[PDB]
Amino acid sequence: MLRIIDTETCGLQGGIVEIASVDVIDGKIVNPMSHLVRPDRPISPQAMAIHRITEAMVADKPWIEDVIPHYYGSEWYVAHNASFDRRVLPEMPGEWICTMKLARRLWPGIKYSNMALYKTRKLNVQTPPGLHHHRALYDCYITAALLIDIMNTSGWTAEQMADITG
Amino acid sequence: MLRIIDTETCGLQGGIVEIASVDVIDGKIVNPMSHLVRPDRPISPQAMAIHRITEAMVADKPWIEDVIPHYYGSEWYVAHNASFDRRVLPEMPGEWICTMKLARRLWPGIKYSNMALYKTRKLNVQTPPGLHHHRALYDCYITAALLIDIMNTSGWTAEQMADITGR
DNA sequence: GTAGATTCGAG
DNA sequence: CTCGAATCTACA
Ligand code: NA
Ligand code: NA
Ligand code: NA
Ligand code: NA
C-alpha cells in the first residue's frame, strides 16, 4: 500500500499551511485525507500567491505536531520532490519514494514538475470538488495518477521504487 | 599592468611543457615571453594531440622551477579559466583575473572557450610567427585581445575584474 | 533555502 | 579521457 503525501507551506524554508494524502492500492486511488494546519511562522506573500491559503484560514487549526499522526501507518510515503516534504514535515515513520526521480529514470530529457508530467503523460484523474491546483489534496491526486502511470510503465514495486529513491 | 598567463601541459592534472605571457598596458600588448619547459612527468597523448609538443621538443629544457622566476612580479595575472593555470603552475603572487568568468557575466548564453569567444566577439589579434592554437604564446595573444574587448565593452577596472573572478 | 544532477571549461 | 565551480531544477 502506497501513500501519496503532499504539503503546502509558508515558503521554501518550511512551515505547513496544509497537508493531504491519498492511498494507491491495486492501481486505484482511495482514502483521501486533508488538513489545514496552523503554521509555526507567518505565511510569506510569495507562497500565498501560490496556494492562496490565508492566515485567517489556518488560525483556528491544529499544529502540525497534532495533525501529522493522522498520516502514520503506511509503509511507503510518496511525494513529488519528496526531499522537500520530508524536510518541512516532522519525521515520518516509513520509507520515502520520489516520483520526480522515477519520472526522470523512465522519461529522460523532458520537464519534471508535478503538473508538466501530468500533461506530457496525458493523464486524467477525478480531482475533488472545491479544490484547485496547489492544494494539498488536489496535487495528491495528480501525484498519485503519476505514480500509477510509473508503476504501469515499469512494473516497479514499492521496495524497488524506494531503492531508486535512496 | 595586467599580465596574461598561459600554460601548455601533459594532461589535466599538470606537468608543464610550455609557458608564456604578454603584458597589457593601456589597451596595448607588450613584453611577450615564452619558454618550452621539461615536464615533471610524461606527456600524455591526449595533451599532445592538442598542443603538439613532443617529448624530444622539451627533453633538454629547464624545469618549471628554473623558469617561473621570469614570470613573477606582476600585480595582476590574467588567464582563461585561471583556476587551471593557477593549479598546475607554481604558486604565484599578485591578483588573479579569469576571462572565462568575465565573459560569462558580460555575455550570458554563449560558449566560453578561448576560441569560441574569439569567434563570437570577432576578435582581431596579431599572433606570433610559426605557432598555432594551443601554443601558450599564441593563446596569450588571443586571451589578451579578449581581455581588451572585455574591458572596452564593460569598462570594468582590474579591481572590479578581480572581484568578479572571486577574491 | 535544499540538495542532487548536469554542464563546461582547461591540456 | 579529470573534476571543480557554476548553473539548473524540483518543492511553497
Ligand atoms: Na508538494
Ligand atoms: Na502542492
Ligand atoms: Na590555458
Ligand atoms: Na593554451
Side-chain angles (χ1 to χ4, degrees):
Chain A
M1 179 276 241
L2 291 136
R3 170 156 292 166
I4 287 60
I5 252 263
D6 187 45
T7 197
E8 316 294 338
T9 65
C10 310
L12 293 174
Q13 285 73 14
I16 303 311
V17 273
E18 205 177 15
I19 185 187
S21 66
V22 302
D23 296 338
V24 175
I25 289 160
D26 216 83
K28 285 164 287 166
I29 300 141
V30 305
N31 191 42
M33 310 171 169
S34 68
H35 283 90
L36 287 169
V37 177
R38 190 169 184 188
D40 75 331
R41 76 196 75 180
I43 307 165
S44 77
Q46 304 91 287
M48 215 183 268
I50 282 160
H51 55 60
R52 308 197 151 231
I53 305 161
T54 60
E55 297 281 359
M57 282 165 77
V58 302
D60 62 334
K61 302 287 170 223
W63 305 105
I64 189 59
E65 284 76 18
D66 294 284
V67 327
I68 189 69
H70 298 149
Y71 295 81
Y72 286 0
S74 179
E75 214 151 301
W76 308 104
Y77 290 82
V78 179
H80 204 63
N81 203 8
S83 255
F84 184 74
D85 303 77
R86 159 225 239 139
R87 172 160 73 244
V88 302
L89 285 174
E91 276 218 7
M92 297 300 296
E95 307 285 63
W96 283 94
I97 293 163
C98 178
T99 46
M100 178 180 85
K101 192 159 163 114
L102 309 164
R104 252 227 221 60
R105 165 86 28 101
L106 247 34
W107 310 293
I110 52 165
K111 323 299 272 98
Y112 304 96
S113 68
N114 202 28
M115 189 57 55
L117 265 359
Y118 188 72
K119 93 149 74 136
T120 289
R121 302 290 316 159
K122 303 194 230 288
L123 296 176
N124 216 95
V125 275
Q126 183 304 345
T127 58
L131 280 201
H132 62 270
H133 102 117
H134 273 308
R135 292 302 290 267
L137 185 50
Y138 190 86
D139 287 350
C140 274
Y141 277 98
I142 305 293
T143 296
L146 173 63
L147 183 60
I148 285 154
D149 189 32
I150 288 173
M151 301 179 72
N152 283 350
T153 296
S154 81
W156 290 332
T157 66
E159 351 259 333
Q160 301 186 289
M161 285 186 288
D163 265 23
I164 303 183
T165 284
Chain B
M1 187 276 267
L2 318 150
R3 176 160 295 169
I4 280 77
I5 274 259
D6 190 43
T7 198
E8 305 315 327
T9 75
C10 303
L12 302 158
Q13 274 65 37
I16 310 296
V17 297
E18 204 181 28
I19 189 170
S21 69
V22 290
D23 286 352
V24 160
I25 285 179
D26 296 324
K28 233 219 341 204
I29 304 164
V30 309
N31 194 35
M33 318 182 265
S34 66
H35 299 94
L36 285 167
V37 175
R38 167 117 191 250
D40 72 333
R41 90 198 60 187
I43 306 171
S44 76
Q46 294 89 6
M48 200 176 293
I50 297 156
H51 53 69
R52 229 104 263 213
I53 305 160
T54 48
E55 300 276 24
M57 270 165 89
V58 298
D60 40 50
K61 306 300 219 216
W63 319 90
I64 189 52
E65 288 81 24
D66 317 314
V67 128
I68 197 79
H70 302 283
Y71 293 83
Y72 286 152
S74 182
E75 338 223 354
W76 302 100
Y77 291 96
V78 177
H80 198 72
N81 196 23
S83 236
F84 179 87
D85 303 80
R86 192 174 201 256
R87 206 172 67 243
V88 305
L89 246 18
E91 160 252 89
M92 307 267 326
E95 279 292 6
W96 278 96
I97 288 159
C98 181
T99 37
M100 181 176 85
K101 269 195 123 268
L102 302 175
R104 276 188 110 95
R105 167 88 71 97
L106 190 53
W107 306 297
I110 65 176
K111 315 282 238 27
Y112 301 109
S113 81
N114 208 29
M115 182 50 59
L117 271 352
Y118 183 71
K119 294 166 167 170
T120 293
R121 294 307 300 168
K122 249 167 248 102
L123 298 171
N124 204 81
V125 72
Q126 175 82 287
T127 24
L131 296 166
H132 52 78
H133 187 34
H134 281 109
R135 254 341 254 305
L137 192 52
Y138 187 103
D139 279 4
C140 269
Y141 280 99
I142 302 292
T143 291
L146 162 71
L147 172 79
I148 286 158
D149 185 52
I150 287 185
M151 267 158 91
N152 291 342
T153 307
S154 64
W156 283 327
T157 52
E159 18 272 312
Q160 284 194 297
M161 277 177 282
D163 268 7
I164 299 188
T165 295
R167 218 109 70 129

